[PDB]
Amino acid sequence: SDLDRLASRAAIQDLYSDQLIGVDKRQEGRLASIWWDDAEWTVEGIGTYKGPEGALDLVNNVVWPRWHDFIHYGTNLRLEFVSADKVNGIGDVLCLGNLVEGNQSILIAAVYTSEYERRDGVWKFSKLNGRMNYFTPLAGIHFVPP
Amino acid sequence: SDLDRLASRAAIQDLYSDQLIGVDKRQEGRLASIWWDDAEWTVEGIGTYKGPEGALDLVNNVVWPRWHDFIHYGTNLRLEFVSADKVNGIGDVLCLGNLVEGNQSILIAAVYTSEYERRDGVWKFSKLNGRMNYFTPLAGIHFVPP
Amino acid sequence: SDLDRLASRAAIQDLYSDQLIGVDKRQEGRLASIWWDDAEWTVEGIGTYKGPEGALDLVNNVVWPRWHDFIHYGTNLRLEFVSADKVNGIGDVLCLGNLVEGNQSILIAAVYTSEYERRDGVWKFSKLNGRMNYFTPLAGIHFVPP
């Protein structure tokens, strides 16, 4: 039904934004809430982490210690139904951040490839794959507060 | 109902984009249309402005004279229903602009924290709070037309 | 009906993201799928191209040869119904890219002005107009992969 399809798309759009906001604002509750326990988050070059606790392990131990702070701007999220209970997503993400190593500011252009599964009526992430197309140090530029 | 919830989210997503477009394109009609008369727009460091006329006072007298032009890219707008007639929003905004003072180009990363109220069936802004996390002059870079 | 309006908005939001993704990922199938045969895509300074084959002519012969690669981030897409079967869109697009000429990296801020028509129940593009407000070479910065 059109209504179910639209409600599903809204739920999935919220899951995806919750991933970005949870990682950026370092909100462990929001970030943990969006994953099935067997969901897999793979970062090219780092490895595969599983479920809510795997997601928190990745950001607390690998990602967050590498950065003073960053912001991820998600755009162009496009969803396709593989089946009534499985959705593919693709999204384009622009990340700006302050790297600890070398005190460098960095611009990252990434593509996020995602999968969502509905189980007993509820949608959550089943897969996330992040690939960086640009990883660009910004000579002479440092992102600073007012 | 799911239908009402989805219609409300669409109306609120339009209000929020109308704020950004109205300020960027300097469209006073669009910008005035989105506020209850008792809505409060607070900018950290500038103060609180009230309603459609307060919004126009802020941009005509404080913001627009400071800039030759700018563009605000809104992403990650995430809505939560506090009640059936009150919604909280959070959004991440990337702003690029040409400041009059010093002829500087600036990159701003901001978080917009918003509230919307439904009154007699209609949604409008009741609150907007803007906070800048990055305010970054861009040495050697000036945003210019083709 | 609210349901039809929401379903139409979702279809049109997908058309618009498909334009950006198709041009960026150089996916000819996705890019061709979104146009009526009499749709017109005008780029200020280049000309007017018609339909799916015109769209592919423009990107294969004029745009793609000029760039090693680029990415378009679409935000603030705002839709208005001119009639039940005709929709106006406006959108703000941030483009980052690597130009062949001079090996320059470029930041583009553009406004996309679009029209969509429903024919026998189906939505597709009838018009796209792209205008660049910023076309900014980035001295000392080159977008590179990890």
UniProtKB/TrEMBL annotation, chains A, B, C:
Residues 5-128 form the SnoaL-like domain. SUPFAM superfamilies: NTF2-like (SSF54427). It comes from the Bacteria. Pfam families: SnoaL_4 (PF13577). Signal peptide: none annotated. This is Gamma-hexachlorocyclohexane dehydrochlorinase. It comes from Novosphingobium barchaimii LL02.
